[PDB]
Structure 1
Amino acid sequence: PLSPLPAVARAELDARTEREIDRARLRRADNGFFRSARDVESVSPADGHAVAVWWRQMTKAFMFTTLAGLGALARDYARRDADRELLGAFQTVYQVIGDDLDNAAPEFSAVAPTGPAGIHYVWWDDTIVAPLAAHVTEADRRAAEELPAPVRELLAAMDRLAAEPLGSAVQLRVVETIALDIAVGFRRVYGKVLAGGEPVFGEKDQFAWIDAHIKAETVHATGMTGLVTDAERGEEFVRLVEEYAGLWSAALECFGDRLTG
């Protein structure tokens, strides 16, 4: 009564989706955040702090709206009869959300704090934002929380995706493609923040959030297209990926702009 598309139609949805991500210029060699993170010689505490505050809000919104999007899919499946292949892909989304919410993967539980302190936006706030905030004034702290326009547009697409039954599939499909390059970028950026000529992040353990993400993405991610049940949902999927990818690309370009200002 409710099945994925045959594997041939799905494979072409995957090729259309990867071409969407190419066209959005989200690849390692294309996007201005990755290039700036390699290129800049140093990063000021104020610039690093501001990017860290933006990322905190973006990662918080990614986690909660992806879960909300799984909620929307669950409302449908409560009354329909999803077959096992659909149920397996639904499970994958649940477990991938669980990394950011509860450090389900052993790569994260080995290093993350326990309880709510380990939620990834909170863990980022405690170990990346806070030491940077020690080195910016109160004025700059308030200014950093006035999010730039491309960041607000991304957050708003995420709220729209929180209601879609395909929304958690779109978000995970784009973010898990770019997560590794984002985390490596962060490792390069925060390795270059100096205050008074000394590194703000001087101890290895201070990078634990970032090093854990780099390792989890190097190793790991029933794919996301396994949640598409017909042809016209497939069109909807590709259309939503193109939009969401574009907004991620523009948000990441704002990080690169802030590091080269």
Structure 2
Amino acid sequence: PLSPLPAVARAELDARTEREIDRARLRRADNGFFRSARDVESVSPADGHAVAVWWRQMTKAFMFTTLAGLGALARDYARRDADRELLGAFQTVYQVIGDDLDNAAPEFSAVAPTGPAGIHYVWWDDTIVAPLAAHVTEADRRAAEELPAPVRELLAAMDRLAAEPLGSAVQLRVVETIALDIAVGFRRVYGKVLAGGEPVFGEKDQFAWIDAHIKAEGMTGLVTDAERGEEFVRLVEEYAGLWSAALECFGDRLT
């Protein structure tokens, strides 16, 4: 008979993780990616392509590893009796993943391509990466897929969270905090890509993916005893820490 933690012990867990996202520099003010996406004057097609290829790999990994995380938790609930409040938080994970995988939310079902082309890392690849690729060399395209070390480190932790029953809770809790600021960075940055002084991204609907996301954008409800509460907090710290370092790695490349 699994239950979530009591209400006040769960609210205490929400402050500790909000204080862990603070301590990791993931707010709009404190992370170099967000400022750089505002302050930089323009961005070369090679730089913007490389960031777009890294983002494609990272958001692909996030989608598949959060789903694997949900699966790892499904494995547990198959053998125990979760109470209805836990099942409610479980559905929430399934619904949220369904945006990136299926475009469930109305913000996405409008503009997103149908079928697999609307999976968010594919939609991104098709409408951001691909128009930029035409402006860089084959050698640059190969170089961009050799991911930098802080990007590789985040993907490595994502693969570990794919096997952890709280993995999907840890990943969604941190990524939904920062998702809005990331998509705003991208709207600035990819407006500022000029090939021959001319913007690669000129029309409005070239930003379909970025705009839908800026429009669109509790996980503690999946923590069942106080021990799991502590492994939650620990893993968020590690996870926020690596997300910050990889976002900083974006900023260093735009300058």
Equivalent position of 2:181 in the other structure: 181
- Distance across 2 between alignment mates of 1:188 and 1:67: 30
- Distance across 1 between alignment mates of 2:196 and 2:38: 22
CA deviation vs aligned residue, 1:205-254 (integer Å, no higher than 9, x gap)? 0000000000001xxxxx00000000000000000000000000000000
CA deviation vs aligned residue, 1:145-164 (integer Å, no higher than 9, x gap)? 00000000000000000000
Residue 114 of structure 1 deviates from its aligned partner by 0.1
TM-score, normalised with respect to structure 1: 0.97
Residue 7 of structure 1 deviates from its aligned partner by 0.2
Residue 12 of structure 1 deviates from its aligned partner by 0.3
- Distance across 1 between alignment mates of 2:44 and 2:194: 6
Residue 99 of structure 1 deviates from its aligned partner by 0.1
- Distance across 2 between alignment mates of 1:117 and 1:213: 16
1:258 aligns with 2:253: yes
Residue 119 of structure 1 deviates from its aligned partner by 0.1
TM-score, normalised with respect to structure 2: 1.00
Equivalent position of 2:158 in the other structure: 158
Residue 134 of structure 1 deviates from its aligned partner by 0.6
Residue 46 of structure 1 deviates from its aligned partner by 0.2
- Distance across 1 between alignment mates of 2:102 and 2:226: 35
Residue 54 of structure 1 deviates from its aligned partner by 0.1
Residue 41 of structure 1 deviates from its aligned partner by 0.2
Residue 39 of structure 1 deviates from its aligned partner by 0.5
- Distance across 1 between alignment mates of 2:141 and 2:166: 36
Residue 100 of structure 1 deviates from its aligned partner by 0.2
Unpaired segments ≥5 residues, structure 2: none
- Distance across 2 between alignment mates of 1:231 and 1:76: 18
CA deviation vs aligned residue, 1:113-157 (integer Å, no higher than 9, x gap)? 000000000000000000000100011010000000000000000
Residue 256 of structure 1 deviates from its aligned partner by 0.1
- Distance across 1 between alignment mates of 2:215 and 2:107: 7
- Distance across 2 between alignment mates of 1:238 and 1:113: 37
Unpaired segments ≥5 residues, structure 1: 218-222
Residue 96 of structure 1 deviates from its aligned partner by 0.2
Residue 8 of structure 1 deviates from its aligned partner by 0.5
Residue 9 of structure 1 deviates from its aligned partner by 0.2
- Distance across 2 between alignment mates of 1:69 and 1:2: 18
1:95 aligns with 2:90: no
Residue 178 of structure 1 deviates from its aligned partner by 0.0
Residue 83 of structure 1 deviates from its aligned partner by 0.3
Task: Tell me how many residue pairs correspond in the alignment.
Answer: 255
CA deviation vs aligned residue, 1:10-61 (integer Å, no higher than 9, x gap)? 0000000000000000000000000100010000000000000000000000
Q: Kindly report structure 1 stretches of 4+ aligned residues shifted beyond 2 Å.
A: none
- Distance across 2 between alignment mates of 1:43 and 1:112: 27
Residue 93 of structure 1 deviates from its aligned partner by 0.2
CA deviation vs aligned residue, 1:152-204 (integer Å, no higher than 9, x gap)? 00000000000000000000000000000000000000000001111000110
1:204 aligns with 2:204: yes
- Distance across 1 between alignment mates of 2:142 and 2:72: 35
SS for the counterpart of 2:168 is: helix
SS for the counterpart of 2:97 is: helix
- Distance across 2 between alignment mates of 1:54 and 1:241: 22
Q: Percent identity?
A: 100
SS for the counterpart of 1:178 is: helix
SS for the counterpart of 2:111 is: coil
CA deviation vs aligned residue, 1:70-109 (integer Å, no higher than 9, x gap)? 0000000001000000000000000000000000001100
- Distance across 2 between alignment mates of 1:113 and 1:208: 10
SS for the counterpart of 1:198 is: coil
